[PDB]
């Protein structure tokens, strides 16, 4: 049960973001301060558990597969397994009651088999989030309750493959995907003005 507490005791979010940086998106919605504590690492190959713990405690762990393009040097399942590995490093010990969130986002690069090893390793089925006039879509795994409960427009799988087929045939996601990070505002300090 991820209970909410009053406004004055909420703290600035501490974000570990892998494979993609989301600093330019978080402060656009006010999660970090203007100017100069999010930790971003691209190559996680020789990251050990001690590295993560000394990297301060974390409140939100984020990972994303590279968008449909020439940027996938690694096999697409590599991004999931490495995500699972580091996620278990960053979990707090089951004593403290702070809110800890994690999320994995797929930009339509994981095939049917990799999608099923994805849901098996994160112990939940993904949600598909669309864009309207069908511009873009993303699959999202996360323990954030508002993502797995919001009733998005239904998108069968014959349309998601057409979108990924010509997005890779012609070629960074939208700004309507505030609904990917919007539910997190209530839990951490909001910075604007």
């Amino acid at each position: 049960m991820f209970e909410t507490v009053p406004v004055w005791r909420r703290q600035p979010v501490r974000v570990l973001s892998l494979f993609e940086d989301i600093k330019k998106e978080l402060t656009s919605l006010g999660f970090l301060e203007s100017g100069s504590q999010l930790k971003h690492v691209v190559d996680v190959t020789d990251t050990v558990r001690k590295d993560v713990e000394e990297w301060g405690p974390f409140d939100l762990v984020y990972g994303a597969t590279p968008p449909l393009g020439h940027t996938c040097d690694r096999p697409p399942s590599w991004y999931l397994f490495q995500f699972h590995r580091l996620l278990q490093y960053a979990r707090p010990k089951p004593g403290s009651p702070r809110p800890f969130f994690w999320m994995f986002v797929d930009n339509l690069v994981l095939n049917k088999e990799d999608l099923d090893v994805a849901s098996r390793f994160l112990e939940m089925e993904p949600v598909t989030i669309p864009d309207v006039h069908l511009q873009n879509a993303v699959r999202v795994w996360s323990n954030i309750p508002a993502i797995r409960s919001r009733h998005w427009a239904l998108v069968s799988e014959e349309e998601l493959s057409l979108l990924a087929q010509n997005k890779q045939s012609s070629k960074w996601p939208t700004k309507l995907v505030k609904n990917c990070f919007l539910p997190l505002r209530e839990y951490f300090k909001y910075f604007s003005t």
């Binding site: 690694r74 096999p75 399942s77 590599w78 397994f81 699972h84 278990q88 010990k93 089951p94 090893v117 098996r120 390793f121």
Partner: peptide, 22 residues
Amino acid sequence: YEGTGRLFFEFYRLLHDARPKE
């Protein structure tokens, strides 16, 4: 990360699932 090689991660997964709670 492909073929039957990725079956190693099923071991790594169930090993974690079976560890006693801290």
